[PDB]
């Protein structure tokens, strides 16, 4: 359940609706982030933070107002954490705690983004 960084960039540039979930811890997000991403730390997904779940529901509602599976993309620094978040999100979907989702993480994470897509995104 993955996507290449170059496919993700083409999707982003299409303007088609999706949500990018940044699942890094706060300390990393404080250094640098993609401004369009929604921040939901992996640990919040692990511990079922009800408020981060509300945040995700609210982001979906903003587009859809309760009316297709939602395309969810997941990113972290290198693509190690995001794979774990994808599993949790798929389980929330399957359990109907979330609206139906189609969930993929970005191979190589934000470092692949920095390497191939935008070199102004920093190392850290």
Cα–Cα distances in Å, from 103 out to 114, 119, 124?
Answer: 22, 26, 26
For the domain that residue 2 is a member of, what is the CATH number? 3.40.250.10
The domain total for the chain is 1
Q: Which domain holds residue 49?
A: 1-124
Cα–Cα distances in Å, from 10 out to 6, 58, 100?
Answer: 6, 25, 23
- Longest Cα–Cα distance in the chain: 41
Give the resolution in Å: 1.2
Q: Catalytic site residues?
A: 76
Q: Could you tell me which residues are beta bridge partners of residue 22?
A: 39, 75
Q: Could you tell me which residues are beta bridge partners of residue 103?
A: 72
22 exposed, middle or buried (CB, 10 Å; 0-12, 13-18, 19+)? buried
Sign of torsion over alpha carbons 54, 85, 20, 90: negative
Structure tokens at 16: 């088609």
Per-residue HEC secondary structure of the chain comes to CEECHHHHHHHHHHCCCCEEEECCCHHHHHHCCCCCCEECCHHHHHCCCHHHHHHHHHHHHHHHCCCCCEEEEEECCCCCHHHHHHHHHHHHHHCCCCCCEEEEEECCHHHHHHHHHCCCCCCC
Residue labelled with tokens 């979906």: 60
The answer to whether the CB of 104 falls within 8 A of the CB of 2 is: yes
The answer to whether the CB of 76 falls within 8 A of the CB of 31 is: no
């Amino acid at each position: 359940s993955r996507v290449s960084v170059t496919d993700y960039k083409r999707l982003l540039d299409s303007g088609a609706f999706h949500l990018l979930l940044d699942v890094r811890p706060q300390v990393e997000v404080d250094i640098c982030r993609l401004p369009h991403a929604l921040h939901i730390p992996l640990k919040h997904l692990e511990r079922r933070d009800a408020e981060s779940l509300k945040l995700l529901k609210e982001a979906i509602w903003e587009e859809k107002q309760g009316t297709a599976a939602v395309p969810i993309y997941v990113i972290c620094k290198l693509g190690n954490d995001s794979q774990k978040a994808v599993k949790i999100l798929q389980s929330l979907s399957a359990a109907q705690e979330l609206d139906p989702l189609t969930v993929r993480d970005v191979v190589g994470g934000l470092m692949a983004w920095a390497a191939k897509i935008d070199g102004t995104f920093p190392q850290y």
